[PDB]
């Protein structure tokens, strides 16, 4: 089939059978069942995360990077200095399109910047507040205007500019290491789509649009984090991945949101964590299919 026919079949199916809350809950339960089975089968061990020297580097004891996809550090390497709570996530064309990580701890701030530097990351997407429900969710790894340089071991971080949009801030950060200076763009998203408001997905799509304005391609990983680096991080990953498929005309004939999320959850645990998050991905993906069909319809007018 061609892309138009694949997209139209997804749209026709969505239109002709609306997915109910019970259906979403049943779907998410199968995803959780797969995780139970994989845990019992020892498919994806987390041995490195579990080492005593690495326990204090994990924000949440239940969220440990699978060994096979963990991001290994080597920049200025102590014997466990290789460990960070982060996993590579494959993009549409190959591995390591994304790094999905936790919000750094006071003890992992240096490790965070080592990762960013070592992997030549340009873009950081933060999808949490510093404080949520009154608890601290992420330590300050960024600089703000007027603060000059913050220092994290040998990394000096300053902020040249902030662009304040409706629901997020784009910080232009300058990072210095060993007399080299790099520009990093941090997108700090400080809202989240509301389950009870269909139009509330628009800002998340706008966030990802802007991100892809700054890096269109997959030459270096994009770092995405929230507090745990699962939940909101997975939503963003999944929507972006799908939009890349759409934009490049490579949606597979077997495309499903269920298979997409299945695939993600095998690369970092709980990468999309809740039924509500699963639903947001579905709704966002459907909107993106509609938008790509419009692109096709206008190109076909020639």
Residue numbers in the entry: 1 to 77, 79 to 303
Question: Can you provide the manuscript's text about this entry?
Answer:
Key features of the domain include the PTP signature motif, the mobile Trp-Pro-Asp “WPD” loop that in the closed conformation positions the conserved and catalytically important aspartate residue, and the phosphotyrosine recognition loop. Here we report the crystal structures of 22 PTP domains, including two tandem-domain RPTP structures and a detailed structural comparison of this protein family.
Structural comparisons of all available PTP structures identified four main WPD loop conformations: a closed state, an intermediate state, an open state, and an atypically open state present in STEP, LYP, and GLEPP1. The atypically open state is associated in STEP with a stabilizing 310 helix C-terminal to the WPD loop (Eswaran et al., 2006) and in LYP and GLEPP1 an extra turn of helix α3 following the WPD loop. Structural comparisons identified an atypically open WPD loop conformation in LYP, GLEPP1, and STEP (Eswaran et al., 2006), suggesting a regulatory role in diverse family members. This conformation represents an inactive conformation in which the WPD aspartate is moved far out of the active site. Low crystallographic temperature factors observed in this loop region suggest that the atypically open conformation is stable, and multiple crystal forms ruled out that the WPD loop assumed this conformation as a result of crystal contacts. In the first category are TCPTP, SHP1, SHP2, BDP1, LYP, PEST, PTPBAS, DEP1, MEG2, and GLEPP1, which have a “PTP1B-like” accessible pocket that harbors a basic residue corresponding to Arg24 of PTP1B. The new structural data and analysis presented here suggest that a secondary substrate-binding pocket, similar to that found in PTP1B, is present also in SHP2, BDP1, LYP, SHP1, TCPTP, MEG2, PTPBAS, DEP1, and GLEPP1. The hypothesis that SHP1 and LYP have the potential to interact with phosphoproteins containing adjacent phosphotyrosines is consistent with reports that Zap-70 is a substrate of these PTPs (Pao et al., 2007). The secondary pocket of PTP1B, and more recently LYP, has been successfully exploited in the design of selective bidentate inhibitors (Yu et al., 2007).
